[PDB]
Design a protein around this ligand. Structure first.
Ligand SMILES: CCCCCCCCCCCCCCCCCC(=O)OC[C@H](CO[C@@H]1O[C@H](CO[C@H]2O[C@H](CO)[C@H](O)[C@H](O)[C@H]2O)[C@H](O)[C@H](O)[C@H]1O)OC(=O)CCCCCCCCCCCCCCCCC
Ligand code: CLA
Ligand code: CLA
Ligand code: CLA
Ligand code: CLA
Ligand code: CLA
Ligand SMILES: CCCCCCCCCCCCCCCC(=O)OC[C@H](COP(=O)(O)OC[C@@H](O)CO)OC(=O)CCCCCCCCCCCCCCC
Ligand SMILES: CC1=C(/C=C/C(C)=C/C=C/C(C)=C/C=C/C=C(C)/C=C/C=C(C)/C=C/C2=C(C)CCCC2(C)C)C(C)(C)CCC1
Ligand SMILES: CC1=C(/C=C/C(C)=C/C=C/C(C)=C/C=C/C=C(C)/C=C/C=C(C)/C=C/C2=C(C)CCCC2(C)C)C(C)(C)CCC1
Ligand SMILES: CC1=C(/C=C/C(C)=C/C=C/C(C)=C/C=C/C=C(C)/C=C/C=C(C)/C=C/C2=C(C)CCCC2(C)C)C(C)(C)CCC1
Ligand SMILES: CCCCCCCCCCCCO[C@@H]1O[C@H](CO)[C@@H](O[C@H]2O[C@H](CO)[C@@H](O)[C@H](O)[C@H]2O)[C@H](O)[C@H]1O
Ligand SMILES: CCCCCCCCCCCCCCCCCC(=O)O
Ligand code: OEX
Ligand SMILES: [Cl-]
Ligand SMILES: [Cl-]
Ligand SMILES: [Fe+2]
Lengths: 451, 82, 341, 38, 137, 334
C-alpha cells in the first residue's frame, strides 16, 4: 500500500486521487479505466435506446441522443431521415460495449497489478512532469491520433456512405460529399465571424461541403502540429510564460474543455445542419418561426391578405421588416429572423420572404412540417411534461436539444470552476505557499503600509 | 470527552442489536404497510378514498361553511356520498 | 436536599442530549409540531377546507403535500380537539383542519422552549447569550407570518399552509395581492439575507485562503488544534488583500463577527415589520404620482405599471380556486388577458 | 460614426495587447517566495 | 364517483344506437390518444387551429356529424373540413395518409374505436375542461 | 530598467493603494465605461422600445421615474441577439430609442467582472496567499452571467435579459415564474437553501464568536477594543463555543475545528448559488420546473386539485397579462 494513506501522501481520502500525481503506472491505470467507463456508457446507452426505439415515431419524441448522432453520419436512415435499418445502431452499441470490457481490463491491470511507476520499466512510457520535451512528445502523439479521427470523419463523408444532408434537394437525404471546401478564405473566415446574432461564429456552418473541408484542415493541422511537438521543445518565451507541472497541465485542459462545452451548447441549440431537425427536433427559433408560418397559412386559406394585415401595434401581423429591411415573420418571432431551414427557404427571395411565393407556392409538406415543429418546440418540464409551464399533463416530451444544451452548460461551467481551482493551486504550489503562509516569513509583514 | 452512553458504532456493530432489530424493524414496517393496505388510515383520519371525493354526478367541493355546524356539515356530505 | 434541587440536578445532568428545565417545554412541543406535520402530510386531506388533496395517501409528492389551514368559516378559532367545532371527534378535527392550529401552537411554544434552552445552556457553561439574542429573528418571522398576519386577515385560512408548494402559493399570493416586492421592509429583509450569505461565503473563503502553514499535509485541516492559543489565519494578510481589492477591509475581528450577527438578524426583523403591516392590508402597493400620470397619459409606461398588470392577472386568475368560500364565478369574458394569450 | 469605431478598435487593441504582453513578461516569477519556475 | 358503465355508454351511430365501452377500452383509447393526437389536441383543444375543438357539441354540428363512434372512425380514416367540403388527409393524420403520418400506420379498427370512445367519454368526466383551454385548467 | 520593465513593475506592484495587475488593466477601463454609461442613462436616457413593438418604456429619472421604478431598459426585441454598438446606429437618437446603452453597459460590466475575479487570483498570488477566494466570487458572477447573457442567448434576445433596475428586476422574476415555474425547480430550491442557510450560518457563527469573546475590557468600553489588529493570540474561546453549541444540539453536531468550520461557511452558500445560477442558465434552454398540473385524479377521472394547481392558476394570470401587445399567435415559444 504505497502512498495509500494521508500520513504518507499528505492528501486526505476525499482528495485521494492526488496521491497518484507521481505514480505514473497507477495513474495510467486510472485513465484507462475511466476511458473504459466512457466507452461502456456509449455502448450500454445506445443499446438501451435501440431496445426502447419505435422506428415509426420521430427520434426526438422518444428521448434519444445517441441514435441521432449515428443517423447524422448517414447510418440507418433514408430520405427525410426515415429509419430503414437499425442494425448499424445495434452494431455501434455492441462494438463500443465489447471495447469497454477490454479497456476496463487494461485499466484495472495498470491500476492494481502492474508496476506502480513506469520510469524504471521503460523510459519511453515513463515521464517526468517537468520534462518539457517528453511532455510535448506525448502531446504530439495524441495530436496525431486526433487528426486521424478528424480524417476518419472525412472518410465517412467522402468514401463510405456519406452524411445525412438536411439541405439535399428533395427533402433531406444521405449524400456523398465530393467537393469539400478547401478554400482557406472560407474555412478561416468562419473563425473570424462575430459570435453575435446573424453571424454565429462557427455555429453558423450551414453546409456539409464546409464541414468536410474544415475537418480536412483540422486533421492535417493536427498531424503537422503533433509532428512539430514530437520534434521540438518549448521555446524560451513559452518556458517563461507557463507553469510546468501535472496540475498545471490538468488546469489548462480544464479551461479548454470548459470552452468546448459552452461552444457545444450553442451548436446544439442553434445549428440545424450537423444536428438535423429530422433527428434532434426543431430549434427554438425554428419552432417559433413555424408557428408564424402555420397561422399565416391558416388565415390566408380563410381569405386574409397577409401582406397587408396590420397587427395591434401597427406592425404587420404576419409579415414585417427587419432592422435592415428584409421581409420577415411578424410577432415576437421577429427576434428569430436569422433562422434558416429547408422547409422555409423556398419562400425566400432576394429581399426576404416573398409575398407571391407565400400566396401561391406553399406546399402541403411545408404546412405539415410547420405544424409538426410548432407543436414540438423545445419547451418542457423537468419531469418531461411537454409544453409551456402552465400546460396540463398529457404530452410526455422534452426536446433532445434542451437535454443536451442544459447538461453541457452545467458541465462547461463546473469545468470552468475546475480550471480556476487547479490553475490557482498549481501557481501556489509551484511558488511554494499552497499549504499556507510561513509564520516566520509572512510576505505582507515586510511590505510598506498602504497608508 | 463522552457522557457515558454506549457508543453508537459499538451498538450498531453488535450481534445482539441486530438480533433484536431484524425482528423489530420489519414488524413496524409491516404494521405501517397494513395500516394502509387494510384501509384503516382512511377511517382514522377521515381521508376520502379515490371513489369518495364526489357523488357520481357531483362536481362541487364539499366545503365547510359554518363554524359551529361544521361537524354536522361534514357528516351530511359523507351521507350524500352514499 | 430539597426535591426542587434534586430535580434541578437531574435535569442538568451532562448527557448525550441535554434536557434542562427548558426541556420540559421544548421537547413535547417540538415533537408534537414535527410529528403533526409528518402525520398530516402522510395521511390527512384538505378536501373539506380547501377542496385540495394534500397527503401522500391521496397521491401527492414531497413538493405538494401540506398541512393546510382551516376553512375560512372557522375564523380565528383555536380549534381545540375538545372545542365546540370538533367536539372531541378526532376524525372530524383532522377534517376541519385542527392539525394546522395544533402545529402552529405547539411550534410557537417549541420556539419559546428552544430560545429558553439557548439561555439556560449559555448560563450553565458560562458564555454570553448572543446566540439566544440572534434567535429572536426567526421567532419574529414566525410570529409575524403565522400568527399576526392571519389574525389581521379574515381567518387562519390565509396564513401559510405548512408545505412546500403551499409556501410557494403564499409567495405568489403576496405578490399578486400585496405587491410585496415593492415594500421597502421586504427589500431590507432581502438585503439582510443576501448580505448574510455574502458575508458567510466571503469570510469562510478568506479564512481558508489566509491560513498559516501549521503542518506538512496538503490537506490543511489537520493543522489546527482546538486548544491552541494562536490565530490559525493571518488577519494582517487578509486585511491587506481586501484593502487593495475592494478598497476597505475589516481590521477588528470582534467587529467582523458582530457584524455577521447584525446583518441577517436585522434584515429578518425588518421583513417581520413589513408583514405586520400587510396583516392590515397596509401595503406599499402603488406610487400615486405614477398612477396619476399614467391615467392621464396613455403613452407613459414603466416597469412599475407593467408589474401592476401582472398583479391584476394573478388576482383574477387565481382567486376563484384559491378562495373557494367567496364562491367566485368570473365569466370568461371578464378575465384580463393580453392579445392572443 | 466611423471615427468612433476606429477609435474604439485602437483603444481596445491597446489594452488587450497590454494584457497579453504583460502576462508574457515573466509573470510566474512575480511572487514573494520562489522565482525560478522556468 | 366511479367510472361506471353508464359513463362509458356513448352513441355508436347516427340513429341513436349506443355502445358500452369497457374500462380497458377507455384506458387504451386514452393511451392511444396521447400517443397519436395529444401533441395537437391536448385537453380537447386544437393547437394549430383553436377555432375548432373536440367538444361533443362541436362534433355534433360538424358535417357529417362526428358525435358518434362511427363518425369519428370515419374522420380518422378520411378527415374533412368542418362543412365536409374538402378532404384534408394531406395535412391531417389519417389511415389514408399514414405514409406521411407514420404514427397512424399500425392503428387497427379496434384502436380507432378506442380513440373515438375516449374522445366521447372524456367530456362526460371533465365537463367544460374538455376543449376549454387554459381558462379552465 | 527599460521603460517596459518599469511599467510592468508598476502594474504588478503590491505597494499601490489599489492593486492594478494585468487583469486590472482590462477591469479599470471597462468598469469605468459601464459605470459612467449606467449613471448617465439611469438619470437621463429617453424611453426604449424594449419589446420591439414601437411602445417605448420609460426608464430614466428625468422621464418620470423614481429610484424604485427607474431602470436602464434592455435593448429592443427587433435587435434580438445582434451586436448593437453606437457606430452601428445612424444616430445617437436611434441608438437610444433602440436601447443601445443596455448592451454597452452589460458587455463592459461582464468583461470587467470577469477581470475582477482574475484580479482576486492575481493579488493572492502576489501576496503569497492561497488562491480560492476568486472561486468563491465565481458564484455571484455566474449568476450575473446567467441573467445578463445566458438567458438572452437561450431565448434569442437581449430584450429578455434582466433590466438594470429594481422594479425591472421584479418584472423579470415574475415573468420567469410564469414561463418556467422556477419555484418548482430543484436548482432554485437549492439556491434558497444556499441563501437561507448562508444567512443562518452567518448569524450562528457571528453569535457564537461574540458569545465566546474573552474578557479584556470594562463595561464602559466596547468589547471590540479587546482585540488589537495583528495580535498573535485568538480573541475568543472556541473550546467554550463548542461546549455551548454541542450541548445546544449534541456533541457531534458542532465543529471543534475552526478550519473545518470556515470551510463549511464558505461551501454552503457558494454551492447553493452555483446551483441557482445553473437553474437560470438551464431554464434558458426551456428545461423548466416540475409540472404536476392535474397529477391527482379520482376514480371517475375528476381532477383533484393540489397546491401545485393553485400555483398554476397564478402562473396563468402572469402569462396571459405579460407583454400584452406583443403576441399574435396562441403559444409563447420564447
Ligand atoms: C480564453 C479567453 C476567451 C475569451 C474570448 C471571449 C471573446 C468575447 C466573446 C463573447 C462571448 C459572448 C458572445 C455572444 C454569445 C452568443 O450569442 O452566442 C450565440 C452564438 C450562436 O449564434 C447564433 O448563430 C446562429 C447560426 O445559425 C444559423 O445557421 C444554422 C446552420 O444550420 C441554422 O441554419 C440557423 O437557423 C441559422 O440561424 C444565428 O446566426 C443566430 O442569429 C446567432 O445568434 O454562439 C457562438 O458563437 C458560440 C460561442 C458562444 C460561447 C458562449 C459563451 C458562454 C460564456 C459563459 C461564461 C460563463 C462565465 C461564468 C463565470 C464564472
Ligand atoms: C478532468 C477532470 C478533473 C481531474 C482529472 C481532476 C483531478 C483532481 N482534482 Mg479537480 N475538479 C474538477 C475536474 C478534475 N479534477 C472540476 C471540474 C472541479 C470543479 C467542481 C474540480 C474541483 C476540485 C477540488 C475542489 C479539489 C480537486 C482535487 C483534485 C484531485 C483529487 C480528486 C479526488 O480525489 O476526488 C475524489 C472524488 C470525490 C470525493 C467524489 C466527488 C463527487 C462529486 C462532488 C459529485 C458528483 C456527482 C455526480 C456527477 C452525479 C451524482 C448523481 C446523484 C446526485 C444521484 C485530483 C488531482 C482536490 C485537490 O486539490 O487535490 C490536489 C480538491 O480539493 N478538484
Ligand atoms: C474513475 C474513477 C476513479 C478511478 C479510475 C480511480 C483510480 C484509482 N484510485 Mg481513486 N478515487 C475515486 C475515483 C477513482 N479512482 C473517488 C471517487 C474517490 C473518493 C472516494 C477516490 C479516492 C481514492 C483514494 C483515497 C485513493 C485512490 C487510489 C486510486 C488508485 C489505486 C486504487 C487501489 O489501490 O485500489 C485498491 C482497491 C481494491 C483492490 C478493490 C478492488 C478495486 C477494483 C479495481 C474494482 C474493479 C471492478 C471492475 C468491475 C473489474 C472489471 C474487470 C473486467 C474488465 C475483467 C487508482 C489508480 C489510491 C492511490 O492513489 O494509491 C496510490 C488511494 O489511496 N482513490
Ligand atoms: C493509452 C493506454 C495504454 C498505455 C499507454 C499502455 C502502456 C503500457 N502497458 Mg498497458 N494496456 C492497455 C493500455 C495502455 N497500456 C490496455 C487497454 C490493456 C488491456 C488489454 C493493457 C494491458 C497491458 C498488460 C497486460 C501489460 C501492459 C504493459 C504496458 C507497458 C508496455 C506496453 C508495450 O510494450 O507495448 C507493446 C505494444 C503493442 C503490443 C502494440 C499495441 C498496439 C495496439 C494493439 C493497436 C494499436 C493501438 C491503437 C491506437 C489502439 C486504439 C484503441 C482505441 C479504440 C482506444 C506500457 C507501460 C505491460 C507492462 O506493464 O509490463 C510491465 C503488460 O504486461 N499493458
Ligand atoms: C492540444 C493542442 C495543443 C497544445 C496544448 C499545444 C501547446 C503548445 N504549443 Mg503547439 N500546436 C498545436 C497544438 C497544440 N499545441 C498544433 C495543432 C500546431 C500546428 C499548427 C501547433 C504549433 C505550434 C508552434 C508552431 C509552436 C507551438 C508552441 C506551443 C507551446 C506554447 C503554446 C502557447 O503559448 O499558446 C498560447 C498562445 C499564444 C501565446 C499566442 C496566441 C494567443 C492569442 C492572443 C489567444 C487568442 C484567443 C482568441 C482570441 C479567443 C477565442 C479563441 C477562438 C479563436 C477559438 C505549448 C507547449 C510553441 C512552442 O514553444 O513550441 C516549440 C510554438 O512556437 N505550437
Ligand atoms: C409542555 C407541554 C405542552 C404544552 C405547553 C402544550 C400546549 C398546548 N396543547 Mg399540547 N399536548 C402535550 C403537551 C403540551 N401541550 C402532550 C404531551 C400531549 C399528548 C398527551 C398533548 C396533546 C394535545 C392535544 C391533543 C391538543 C393539545 C392542545 C394544546 C393547546 C391547548 C392546551 C390547553 O388549553 O390546555 C389547558 C390546560 C391547562 C392550562 C392546564 C392547567 C393546569 C391547572 C393546574 C389545572 C387547575 C384546575 C384543575 C381542574 C385541577 C383540579 C385539581 C383537583 C380538583 C383534582 C396548547 C397550545 C390542543 C390544540 O393544539 O388545539 C389546536 C389539542 O387539541 N395538546
Ligand atoms: C466532531 C464533529 C465535527 C464535524 C462537524 C459536523 C458537521 C455537522 C453534522 C451534523 C449532524 C451530525 C452527524 C453526526 C456526526 C458524527 O460524527 O457521527 C458520529 C456520532 C457519534 O458516534 P459514536 O456514538 O460512534 O461515537 C464514537 C465516540 O466514541 C467518539 O466518536 O454519531 C452521532 O452523533 C449520530 C447519532 C445520531 C443522534 C440522533 C439523536 C436524535 C436525538 C433527537 C434530539 C436531538 C437534540 C435536539 C436538540 C433540541
Ligand atoms: C480502478 C479503481 C476504480 C475504477 C474501476 C473502473 C472504472 C473499472 C471499469 C471497468 C469496466 C469499464 C468494465 C467493463 C466491463 C464490460 C463488460 C464485462 C462487458 C460485457 C458485455 C457483454 C457480455 C455483452 C453482451 C451482449 C451482447 C454482446 C449483445 C447484446 C446483448 C448483451 C448485452 C447481453 C474504482 C472507482 C472502483 C476505485 C478503486 C480503483
Ligand atoms: C472543423 C470545422 C471547421 C473548422 C474549424 C477550425 C479551422 C478551427 C480552428 C480553431 C483554432 C485555430 C483555434 C485556436 C484557438 C486558440 C486558443 C484558444 C488560444 C488560447 C491562448 C491562451 C489560453 C493564452 C493564454 C495566455 C495569455 C493570453 C497571455 C500570456 C499567458 C498565457 C500564455 C497563459 C469549420 C468551422 C470550418 C466548419 C465546421 C467544422
Ligand atoms: C399529531 C398528533 C399526535 C402526535 C403524533 C406524532 C408525534 C407523530 C409522529 C410521527 C413521526 C415521527 C413520523 C415520522 C415519519 C418519518 C418519515 C416519513 C421519514 C421519511 C424519510 C425520508 C423519506 C428520508 C429520505 C432520505 C433521503 C431522500 C436522502 C438522504 C437520506 C434520507 C433517508 C434522509 C398525537 C399522538 C399527540 C395525537 C394528536 C395528533
Ligand atoms: C496578438 C498576439 C500577441 C501574442 C503573440 C505571441 C507572442 C509570443 C512571442 C512573444 C515573446 C515575448 O517574449 C517575452 O518578452 C518579455 C517582455 O519583453 C520578456 O520579459 C522580460 O523582460 C522584461 C523587460 O522588457 C521584464 O519586464 C520581464 O520581467 C522579463 O521577463 C520575456 O522574458 C519574454 O519571454
Ligand atoms: C399545558 C399542557 C396542555 C396539555 C393538553 C393535553 C391535551 C390532551 C387532550 C386529550 C383528551 C381530549 C378530550 C377529548 C374529549 C373532549 C370532547 C368534548 O367534550 O368536547
Ligand atoms: O420579450 Mn420578454 O418574455 Ca420571453 O416568452 Mn415570449 O419573448 Mn416576451 O413573451 Mn413571454
Ligand atoms: Cl410584462
Ligand atoms: Cl407572437
Ligand atoms: Fe470567523
Amino acid at each position: 500500500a504505497t502512498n495509500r494513506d494521508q500520513e504518507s501522501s499528505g492528501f486526505a481520502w476525499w482528495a485521494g486521487n492526488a496521491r497518484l500525481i507521481n505514480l505514473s503506472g497507477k495513474l495510467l491505470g486510472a485513465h484507462v479505466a475511466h476511458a473504459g467507463l466512457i466507452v461502456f456508457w456509449a455502448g450500454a446507452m445506445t443499446l438501451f435506446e435501440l431496445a426502447h426505439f419505435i422506428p415509426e415515431k420521430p427520434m426526438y419524441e422518444q428521448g434519444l441522443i445517441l441514435i441521432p448522432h449515428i443517423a447524422t453520419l448517414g447510418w440507418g436512415v433514408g430520405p427525410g431521415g426515415e429509419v430503414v435499418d437499425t442494425f448499424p445502431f445495434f452494431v455501434v452499441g455492441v462494438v463500443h460495449l465489447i471495447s469497454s470490457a477490454v479497456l476496463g481490463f487494461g485499466g484495472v491491470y495498470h491500476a492494481i497489478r502492474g508496476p506502480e511507476t513506469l520510469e524504471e520499466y521503460s523510459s519511453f512510457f515513463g515521464y517526468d512532469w517537468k520534462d518539457k520535451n517528453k511532455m510535448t512528445t506525448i502531446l504530439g502523439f495524441h495530436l496525431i491520433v486526433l487528426g486521424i479521427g478528424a480524417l476518419l470523419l472525412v472518410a465517412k463523408a467522402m468514401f463510405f456512405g456519406g452524411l445525412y444532408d438536411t439541405w439535399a434537394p428533395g427533402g433531406g437525404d444521405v449524400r456523398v460529399i465530393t467537393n469539400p471546401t478547401l478554400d482557406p478564405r472560407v474555412i478561416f473566415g468562419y473563425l473570424l465571424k462575430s459570435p453575435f446574432g446573424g453571424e454565429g461564429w462557427i455555429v453558423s456552418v450551414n453546409n456539409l461541403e464546409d464541414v468536410v473541408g474544415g475537418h480536412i484542415w483540422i486533421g492535417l493541422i493536427c498531424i503537422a502540429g503533433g509532428i512539430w511537438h514530437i520534434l521540438t521543445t518549448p521555446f524560451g518565451w513559452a518556458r517563461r510564460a507557463f507553469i510546468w507541472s501535472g496540475e498545471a497541465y490538468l488546469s489548462y485542459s480544464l479551461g479548454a474543455l470548459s470552452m468546448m462545452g459552452f461552444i457545444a451548447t450553442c451548436f446544439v441549440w442553434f445549428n440545424n445542419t450537423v444536428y438535423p431537425s429530422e433527428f434532434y427536433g426543431p430549434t427554438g427559433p425554428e419552432a417559433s418561426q413555424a408557428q408564424a408560418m402555420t397561422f399565416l397559412i391558416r388565415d390566408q386559406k380563410l381569405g386574409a391578405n397577409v401582406g397587408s394585415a396590420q397587427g395591434p401595434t401597427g406592425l404587420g401581423k404576419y409579415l414585417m421588416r427587419s432592422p435592415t429591411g428584409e421581409i420577415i415573420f411578424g410577432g415576437e418571432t421577429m427576434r428569430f429572423w436569422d433562422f434558416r431551414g429547408p422547409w422555409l427557404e423556398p419562400l425566400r427571395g432576394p429581399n426576404g420572404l416573398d409575398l407571391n411565393k407565400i400566396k401561391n407556392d406553399i406546399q402541403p409538406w411545408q404546412e405539415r412540417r410547420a405544424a409538426e415543429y410548432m407543436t414540438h418546440a423545445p419547451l418542457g418540464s423537468l419531469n418531461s411534461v411537454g409544453g409551456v409551464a402552465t400546460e396540463i399533463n398529457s404530452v410526455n416530451f422534452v426536446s433532445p436539444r434542451s437535454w443536451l444544451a442544459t447538461s453541457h452548460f452545467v458541465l462547461a461551467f463546473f469545468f470552468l470552476v475546475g480550471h480556476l481551482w487547479h490553475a490557482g493551486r498549481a501557481r501556489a504550489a509551484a511558488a511554494g505557499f499552497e499549504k499556507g503562509i510561513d509564520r516566520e516569513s509572512e510576505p505582507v509583514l515586510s511590505m510598506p503600509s498602504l497608508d | 470527552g463522552t457522557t457515558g452512553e454506549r457508543p453508537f458504532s459499538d451498538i450498531i456493530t453488535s450481534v445482539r442489536y441486530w438480533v433484536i432489530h431484524s425482528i423489530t424493524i420489519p414488524a413496524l414496517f409491516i404494521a405501517g404497510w397494513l395500516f394502509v393496505s387494510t384501509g384503516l388510515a382512511y377511517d382514522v383520519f377521515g381521508t376520502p378514498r379515490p371513489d369518495s371525493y364526489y357523488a357520481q354526478e357531483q362536481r362541487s367541493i364539499p366545503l365547510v361553511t359554518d363554524r359551529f355546524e361544521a361537524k354536522q356539515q361534514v357528516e351530511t356530505f359523507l351521507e350524500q356520498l352514499k | 436536599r430539597g426535591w426542587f434541587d434534586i430535580l434541578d440536578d437531574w435535569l442538568k445532568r451532562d448527557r448525550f442530549v441535554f434536557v434542562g428545565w427548558s426541556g420540559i417545554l421544548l421537547f413535547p412541543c417540538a415533537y408534537l409540531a414535527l410529528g403533526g406535520w409528518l402525520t398530516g402530510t402522510t395521511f390527512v386531506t384538505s378536501w373539506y377546507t380547501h377542496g385540495l388533496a394534500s397527503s401522500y395517501l391521496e397521491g401527492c409528492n414531497f413538493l405538494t403535500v401540506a398541512v393546510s389551514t382551516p376553512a375560512n368559516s372557522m375564523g380565528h378559532s383555536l380549534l381545540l380537539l375538545w372545542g365546540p367545532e370538533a367536539q372531541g371527534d378526532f376524525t372530524r378535527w383532522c377534517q376541519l383542519g385542527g392539525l394546522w392550529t395544533f402545529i402552529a401552537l405547539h411550534g410557537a411554544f417549541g420556539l419559546i422552549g428552544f430560545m429558553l434552552r439557548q439561555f439556560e445552556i449559555a448560563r450553565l457553561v458560562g458564555v454570553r447569550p448572543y446566540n439566544a439574542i440572534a434567535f429572536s429573528a426567526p421567532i419574529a418571522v414566525f410570529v409575524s407570518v403565522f400568527l399576526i398576519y392571519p389574525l389581521g386577515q379574515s381567518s387562519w385560512f390565509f396564513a401559510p399552509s405548512f408545505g412546500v408548494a403551499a409556501i410557494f402559493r403564499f409567495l405568489l399570493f403576496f405578490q399578486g395581492f400585496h405587491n410585496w416586492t415593492l415594500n421597502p421592509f421586504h427589500m431590507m429583509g432581502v438585503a439582510g439575507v443576501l448580505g448574510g450569505a455574502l458575508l458567510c461565503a466571503i469570510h469562510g473563503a478568506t479564512v481558508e485562503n489566509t491560513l498559516f502553514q501549521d503542518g506538512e499535509g496538503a490537506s490543511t485541516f489537520r493543522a489546527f488544534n482546538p486548544t491552541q492559543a494562536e490565530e490559525t489565519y493571518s488577519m494582517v494578510t487578509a486585511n491587506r488583500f481586501w484593502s487593495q481589492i475592494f478598497g476597505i477591509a475589516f481590521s477588528n475581528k470582534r467587529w467582523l463577527h458582530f457584524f455577521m450577527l447584525f446583518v441577517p438578524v436585522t434584515g429578518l426583523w425588518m421583513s417581520a415589520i413589513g408583514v405586520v403591516g400587510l396583516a392590515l392590508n397596509l401595503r406599499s402597493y402603488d406610487f400615486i404620482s405614477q398612477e396619476i400620470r399614467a391615467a392621464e397619459d396613455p403613452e407613459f409606461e414603466t416597469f412599475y405599471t407593467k408589474n401592476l398588470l401582472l398583479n391584476e392577472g394573478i388576482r383574477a386568475w387565481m382567486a376563484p380556486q384559491d378562495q373557494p368560500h367567496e364562491n367566485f364565478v368570473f365569466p370568461e369574458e371578464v378575465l384580463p388577458r393580453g392579445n392572443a394569450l | 460614426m466611423e471615427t468612433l469605431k476606429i477609435t474604439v478598435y485602437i483603444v481596445v487593441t491597446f489594452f488587450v495587447l497590454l494584457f497579453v504582453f504583460g502576462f508574457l513578461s515573466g509573470d510566474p516569477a512575480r511572487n514573494p517566495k520562489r522565482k525560478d519556475l522556468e | 364517483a366511479e367510472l361506471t358503465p353508464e359513463v362509458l355508454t356513448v352513441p355508436l351511430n347516427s340513429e341513436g344506437k349506443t355502445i358500452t365501452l369497457t374500462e380497458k377500452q377507455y384506458l387504451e383509447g386514452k393511451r392511444l390518444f396521447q400517443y397519436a393526437c395529444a401533441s395537437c389536441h391536448v385537453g380537447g383543444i386544437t393547437k394549430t387551429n383553436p377555432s375548432l375543438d373536440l367538444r361533443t357539441e362541436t362534433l355534433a354540428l360538424a358535417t357529417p356529424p362526428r358525435d358518434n363512434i362511427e363518425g369519428l372512425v370515419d374522420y380518422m380514416k378520411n378527415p374533412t373540413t368542418y362543412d365536409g367540403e374538402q378532404e384534408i388527409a394531406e395535412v391531417h393524420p389519417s389511415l389514408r395518409s399514414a405514409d406521411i403520418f407514420p404514427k397512424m400506420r399500425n392503428l387497427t379498427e379496434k384502436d380507432l374505436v378506442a380513440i373515438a370512445g375516449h374522445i366521447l367519454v372524456e367530456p362526460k368526466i371533465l365537463g367544460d375542461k374538455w376543449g376549454g383551454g387554459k381558462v379552465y385548467y | 530598467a527599460n521603460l517596459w520593465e518599469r511599467f510592468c513593475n508598476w502594474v504588478t506592484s503590491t505597494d499601490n493603494r489599489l492593486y492594478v495587475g494585468w487583469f486590472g488593466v482590462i477591469m479599470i477601463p471597462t468598469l469605468l465605461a459601464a459605470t459612467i454609461c449606467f449613471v448617465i442613462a439611469f438619470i437621463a436616457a429617453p424611453p426604449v422600445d424594449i419589446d420591439g413593438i414601437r411602445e417605448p418604456v420609460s426608464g430614466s429619472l428625468l422621464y418620470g421615474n423614481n429610484i424604485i421604478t427607474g431602470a436602464v431598459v434592455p435593448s429592443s426585441n427587433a435587435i434580438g441577439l445582434h451586436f448593437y454598438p453606437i457606430w452601428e446606429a445612424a444616430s445617437l437618437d436611434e441608438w437610444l430609442y433602440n436601447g443601445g446603452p443596455y448592451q454597452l453597459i452589460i458587455f463592459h460590466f461582464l468583461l470587467g467582472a470577469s477581470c475582477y475575479m482574475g484580479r482576486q487570483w492575481e493579488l493572492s498570488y502576489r501576496l503569497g496567499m492561497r488562491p480560492w477566494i476568486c472561486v468563491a466570487y465565481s458564484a455571484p458572477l455566474a449568476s450575473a452571467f446567467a441573467v445578463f447573457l445566458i438567458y438572452p442567448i437561450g431565448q434569442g434576445s437581449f430584450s429578455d435579459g434582466m433590466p438594470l433596475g429594481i422594479s425591472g428586476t421584479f418584472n423579470f422574476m415574475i415573468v420567469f415564474q410564469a414561463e418556467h415555474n422556477i419555484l418548482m425547480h430543484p436548482f432554485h430550491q437549492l439556491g434558497v437553501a444556499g441563501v437561507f442557510g448562508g444567512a443562518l450560518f452567518c448569524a450562528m457563527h457571528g453569535s457564537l464568536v461574540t458569545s465566546s469573546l474573552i474578557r479584556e475590557t470594562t463595561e464602559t468600553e466596547s468589547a471590540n477594543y479587546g482585540y488589537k489588529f495583528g495580535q498573535e493570540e485568538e480573541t475568543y474561546n472556541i473550546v467554550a463555543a463548542h461546549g455551548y453549541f454541542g450541548r445546544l444540539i449534541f456533541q457531534y453536531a458542532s465543529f471543534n475545528n475552526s478550519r473545518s468550520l470556515h470551510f463549511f461557511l464558505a461551501a454552503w452558500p457558494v454551492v447553493g448559488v452555483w446551483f441557482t445560477a445553473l437553474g437560470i442558465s438551464t431554464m434558458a434552454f426551456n428545461l423548466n420546473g416540475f409540472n404536476f398540473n392535474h397529477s391527482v385524479i379520482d376514480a371517475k377521472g375528476n381532477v383533484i386539485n393540489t397546491w401545485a394547481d393553485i400555483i398554476n392558476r397564478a402562473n396563468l394570470g402572469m402569462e396571459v397579462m405579460h407583454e400584452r401587445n406583443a403576441h399574435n399567435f396562441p403559444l409563447d415559444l420564447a
